[PDB]
C-alpha cells in the first residue's frame, strides 16, 4: 500500500482502468478479425469498461502527462486518476501516503481537471 508488501513490484509500470480497457479491446478486434477468449479476460474487460472514467485515448495521454508533471510516485499516478475523488481532501482523506507529501492548493485543481477530462 503506502509501503510495499512484495519485493519486486517497484520496477513495473502502473496502468489506469482505461489504459487496460483500451488495450484489452484492441486484443478482441485483433482476435475475432483473425479460438475463444478466456473468462477471466472477459470479466476483467467488462469490469474495466464499467469503471472507465476516460473514454478517449487522448484524455488518457493528457492525464498521464500531467500526472507525471505532478512528480508523485508511479503507483500514485494511476491510483487516483481512475478513482476520481470529488474532494482533494478525499485524497488525503484516504491514501495514507499522500497527505503531507503535497499541499491542498493543487489537489482540488487536479481533481477538477480530472473530472473535466472525464
Amino acid at each position: 500500500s503506502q509501503l510495499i508488501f512484495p519485493k519486486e513490484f517497484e520496477t513495473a509500470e502502473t496502468l489506469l482502468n482505461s489504459e487496460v480497457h483500451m488495450l484489452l479491446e484492441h486484443r478482441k478486434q485483433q482476435n475475432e478479425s483473425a479460438q475463444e477468449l478466456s473468462e477471466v479476460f472477459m470479466k476483467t474487460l467488462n469490469y474495466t469498461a464499467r469503471f472507465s472514467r476516460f473514454k478517449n485515448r487522448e484524455t488518457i495521454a493528457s492525464v498521464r502527462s500531467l500526472l507525471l508533471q505532478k512528480k508523485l510516485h508511479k503507483f500514485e499516478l494511476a491510483c487516483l486518476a481512475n478513482l476520481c475523488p470529488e474532494t482533494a481532501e478525499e485524497s488525503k482523506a484516504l491514501i495514507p501516503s499522500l497527505e503531507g507529501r503535497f499541499e491542498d492548493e493543487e489537489l482540488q485543481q487536479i481533481l477538477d481537471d480530472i473530472q473535466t477530462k472525464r
Binding site: 520496477t11 489506469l16 478466456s38 477471466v40 479476460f41 476483467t44 474495466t48 478525499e90 482523506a93 484516504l94
Partner: protein, 171 residues
C-alpha cells in the same frame, strides 16, 4: 492495482510443431498457457501485451520436447493489502457481502462495515440498507471499499474488505 511488468515463462514445445511456424506456435502457446493463470507470485495476469524475445530452445535430452524461455510484457492486476478499490456487489448475505472487483470475488464482514448498514429481509431486491434509506446497495452497484487482507488459495485469490474510511460508499 493494474501493472505492466515484463516476466518469464518456460514453453515446452512438442516435436509436432517443428515446421515453418514454430515461433508462431510458441507465441500462441504462451498466450494459451499464460493469459489467465492465477499465480501467487504475481497475482493475476490479464493479457500478454507483447513478446520481448523468444529464447534459445534447448532440446530436452530423452524427451523430445524443446524448452523455450519466453520473456513477455503483460498487463497484471494485483490487489495489494491495505488499498481502496471500487467493487461491484454480486450477492448479499447475513455473514457478509460478496462483491466482484473484476477478475476476483471479495468478502466484506458485517462487523467490518459501519453499524448503519443493516440487512433488508423479504424484499425482492435483497440488500444492506440504512434505516433512513440514505444509501442502498442492490445488485450491480459500485462500492468503494478498503481491502484489509490478501491470502493465497493458489487458484483464485480473494480479498477480504471493510469500509472504515470516508467516501467508502456508493458512487
Amino acid at each position: 492495482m493494474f501493472y505492466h511488468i515484463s516476466l518469464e515463462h518456460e514453453i515446452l514445445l512438442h516435436p509436432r510443431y517443428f515446421g515453418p511456424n514454430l515461433l508462431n506456435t510458441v507465441k500462441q502457446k504462451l498466450f494459451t498457457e499464460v493469459e489467465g493463470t492465477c499465480t501467487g507470485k504475481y497475482g493475476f495476469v490479464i493479457a500478454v501485451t507483447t513478446i520481448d524475445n523468444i529464447g534459445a530452445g534447448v532440446i530436452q535430452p530423452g524427451r523430445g520436447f524443446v524448452l523455450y524461455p519466453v520473456k513477455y510484457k503483460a498487463i497484471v492486476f494485483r490487489p495489494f493489502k491495505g488499498e481502496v478499490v471500487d467493487a461491484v456487489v454480486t450477492q448479499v448475505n447475513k455473514v457478509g457481502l460478496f462483491t466482484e472487483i473484476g477478475p476476483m470475488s471479495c468478502f466484506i464482514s458485517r462487523h467490518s462495515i459501519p453499524s448503519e448498514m443493516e440487512f433488508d429481509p423479504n424484499s425482492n431486491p435483497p440488500c444492506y440498507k440504512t434505516m433512513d434509506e440514505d444509501i442502498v446497495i442492490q445488485q450491480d452497484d459500485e462500492i468503494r471499499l478498503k481491502i484489509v487482507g490478501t491470502r493465497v488459495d493458489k487458484n483464485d485469490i480473494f480479498a477480504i474488505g471493510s469500509l472504515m474510511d470516508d467516501y467508502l460508499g456508493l458512487v
